[PDB]
Design an enzyme around this catalytic site. Structure first.
Site, PDB file in Angstrom:
ATOM      1  N   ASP A  45       0.843  -1.180   0.000  1.00  0.00           N
ATOM      2  CA  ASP A  45       0.000   0.000   0.000  1.00  0.00           C
ATOM      3  C   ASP A  45       0.883   1.236   0.000  1.00  0.00           C
ATOM      4  O   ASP A  45       1.735   1.390   0.879  1.00  0.00           O
ATOM      5  CB  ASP A  45      -0.879  -0.014   1.248  1.00  0.00           C
ATOM      6  CG  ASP A  45      -1.767   1.200   1.323  1.00  0.00           C
ATOM      7  OD1 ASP A  45      -1.283   2.244   1.814  1.00  0.00           O
ATOM      8  OD2 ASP A  45      -2.954   1.128   0.883  1.00  0.00           O
ATOM      9  N   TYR A  50       2.842  10.185  -0.196  1.00  0.00           N
ATOM     10  CA  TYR A  50       3.966   9.745   0.625  1.00  0.00           C
ATOM     11  C   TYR A  50       5.293  10.089  -0.048  1.00  0.00           C
ATOM     12  O   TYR A  50       6.337  10.037   0.617  1.00  0.00           O
ATOM     13  CB  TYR A  50       3.910   8.238   0.949  1.00  0.00           C
ATOM     14  CG  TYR A  50       2.625   7.719   1.603  1.00  0.00           C
ATOM     15  CD1 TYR A  50       1.727   8.570   2.244  1.00  0.00           C
ATOM     16  CD2 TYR A  50       2.312   6.360   1.559  1.00  0.00           C
ATOM     17  CE1 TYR A  50       0.561   8.081   2.819  1.00  0.00           C
ATOM     18  CE2 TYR A  50       1.139   5.873   2.134  1.00  0.00           C
ATOM     19  CZ  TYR A  50       0.264   6.753   2.747  1.00  0.00           C
ATOM     20  OH  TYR A  50      -0.905   6.288   3.317  1.00  0.00           O
ATOM     21  N   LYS A  79      -2.910   6.016  -4.233  1.00  0.00           N
ATOM     22  CA  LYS A  79      -3.959   6.926  -3.801  1.00  0.00           C
ATOM     23  C   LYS A  79      -3.864   8.246  -4.544  1.00  0.00           C
ATOM     24  O   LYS A  79      -2.765   8.789  -4.745  1.00  0.00           O
ATOM     25  CB  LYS A  79      -3.884   7.193  -2.293  1.00  0.00           C
ATOM     26  CG  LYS A  79      -3.738   5.925  -1.497  1.00  0.00           C
ATOM     27  CD  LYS A  79      -3.992   6.103  -0.021  1.00  0.00           C
ATOM     28  CE  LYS A  79      -3.764   4.819   0.750  1.00  0.00           C
ATOM     29  NZ  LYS A  79      -2.332   4.578   0.985  1.00  0.00           N
ATOM     30  N   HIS A 112      -7.662   9.694  -1.405  1.00  0.00           N
ATOM     31  CA  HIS A 112      -6.967   9.700  -0.106  1.00  0.00           C
ATOM     32  C   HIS A 112      -7.816  10.294   1.008  1.00  0.00           C
ATOM     33  O   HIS A 112      -7.648   9.929   2.185  1.00  0.00           O
ATOM     34  CB  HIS A 112      -5.631  10.430  -0.288  1.00  0.00           C
ATOM     35  CG  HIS A 112      -4.546  10.034   0.658  1.00  0.00           C
ATOM     36  ND1 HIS A 112      -3.247   9.895   0.226  1.00  0.00           N
ATOM     37  CD2 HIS A 112      -4.549   9.763   1.994  1.00  0.00           C
ATOM     38  CE1 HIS A 112      -2.503   9.566   1.263  1.00  0.00           C
ATOM     39  NE2 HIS A 112      -3.252   9.475   2.349  1.00  0.00           N
TER      40      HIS A 112
END
Length: 318
Positions: A45, A50, A79, A112
Site C-alpha cells: 500500500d 507519501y 492513492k 486519499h
C-alpha cells in the site's frame, strides 16, 4: 489469506504499509519494500502523497527482474491526492503514479480523503498564515473519473480513504453510479476500533482497511501517564501473555478477526516477519470482547489541514 472485494477481486488480508516519516531518507523505503517482498508480503500500500512511489516501483521491478515474484502475484494500491480531485486531473494523476511506479496498472486506486485542495505542485498548499488553500469539488464528480480509470484498465478496483458514513452514502446513492467503492481505508486500532463504521461498511460489502494499527507511539504519549499508549496497555499485555504472542501481534489479529485488512508498517526485518505470523493463531471470543473494551475513540491522525472544509470527515459521529 485474502478478502473478497465487491467487484470480484481479492485483496491479501495483511498489507505492507509504506508511509515514510519526513526525516527518513527515501532510499530506506526502497530497501524496506524489497525486504517486505522477500519476507513474503504481496499487498503493498502506497500513496502519491507519501512521495515514495518511485522507490516502491523500483523495489517491485527489482524483485520482478530477480524472478522472485511476478506482477500478477502482487496487489499494489496507490492513492489520488487532494490536489488532484478536479475531474480533469484524476486520470492524469493516476497515469503519473503509474509512471512513477513503473507499472501498467494498479490493483487498487483510492481517494486519499473526501476533501479537495488547490491544484498544483505543492501537496500542502497554504496561505501566508498556514491555512490550507481548499477547493470546491464534489467527491462524487471525482468518483466518476475513478470509474473511468477502471474502465480504461488502469486500475482493477477503486475505493476511498477517510470517508465517513454520510460520505459513503453519497457515493452509494449518487445518480448514475457505475462502481461501488471496494474499501474505505481509515485509521483503526484498539483505541479507535471503528465499530460503527465497520458495521455500516460490512452491510454495504465495503472492506475496512486500517492504517495506524498500533496507535501512537509519540514521545508525549509515553511521558504523560494519563495518555495511554496502546503498545503499553496492561490489558493488551495480559491477552498477549495468555496467547503467547506480542502485544503488536494481538493488536493486528484483533483487526483481522473483525474482517479488517490492516496495513503493517515497519522498516525492520524482524517486525516484518513477526507481523506475517498473524495468521498463525486465533483469539478466543472472551479475548475479542476484552479487546473491544479498550476502545477510547482516540483519533491520532485527525488531518487538521482539512478541518476548514465542509467535507472534513471526522467531526461526525461516524
Amino acid at each position: 489469506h485474502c478478502v473478497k472485494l465487491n467487484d470480484g477481486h481479492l485483496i491479501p488480508a495483511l498489507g505492507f504499509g509504506t508511509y515514510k516519516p519526513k526525516e527518513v531518507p527515501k532510499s530506506k523505503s526502497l530497501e524496506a519494500a524489497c525486504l517486505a517482498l522477500d519476507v513474503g508480503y504481496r499487498h503493498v500500500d502506497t500513496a502519491y502523497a507519501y512521495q515514495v512511489e518511485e522507490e516502491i516501483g523500483q523495489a517491485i521491478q527489482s524483485a520482478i527482474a530477480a524472478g522472485v515474484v511476478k506482477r500478477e502475484d502482487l496487489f499494489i494500491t496507490t492513492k489520488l491526492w487532494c490536489t488532484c480531485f478536479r475531474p480533469e486531473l484524476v486520470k492524469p494523476a493516476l497515469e503519473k503514479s503509474l509512471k512513477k511506479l513503473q507499472l501498467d496498472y494498479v490493483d487498487l486506486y483510492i481517494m486519499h480523503y473526501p476533501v479537495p485542495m488547490k491544484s498544483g505542485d505543492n501537496d500542502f498548499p497554504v496561505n501566508e498564515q498556514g491555512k490550507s488553500l481548499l477547493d470546491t469539488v464534489d467527491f462524487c464528480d471525482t468518483w466518476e473519473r475513478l470509474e473511468e480509470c477502471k474502465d480504461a484498465g488502469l486500475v482493477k478496483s477503486i475505493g476511498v480513504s477517510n470517508f465517513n458514513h454520510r460520505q459513503l452514502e453519497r457515493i452509494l446513492n449518487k445518480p448514475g453510479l457505475n462502481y461501488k467503492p471496494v474499501c474505505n481505508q481509515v485509521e483503526c486500532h484498539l483505541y479507535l476500533n471503528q465499530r460503527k463504521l465497520l458495521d455500516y461498511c460490512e452491510s454495504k460489502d465495503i472492506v475496512l482497511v486500517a492504517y495506524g494499527a498500533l496507535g501512537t507511539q509519540r514521545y508525549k504519549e509515553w511521558v504523560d501517564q494519563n495518555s495511554p499508549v496502546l503498545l503499553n496497555d496492561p490489558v493488551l499485555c495480559d491477552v498477549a501473555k495468555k496467547n503467547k504472542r506480542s502485544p503488536a501481534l494481538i493488536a493486528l489479529r484483533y483487526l483481522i478477526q473483525r474482517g479488517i485488512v490492516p496495513l503493517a508498517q515497519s522498516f525492520k526485518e524482524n517486525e516484518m516477519r513477526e507481523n506475517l505470523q498473524v495468521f498463525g493463531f486465533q483469539l478466543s471470543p472472551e479475548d475479542m470482547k476484552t479487546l473491544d473494551g479498550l476502545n477510547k475513540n482516540f483519533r491520532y491522525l485527525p488531518a487538521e489541514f482539512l478541518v476548514d472544509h465542509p467535507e472534513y470527515p471526522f467531526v461526525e459521529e461516524y
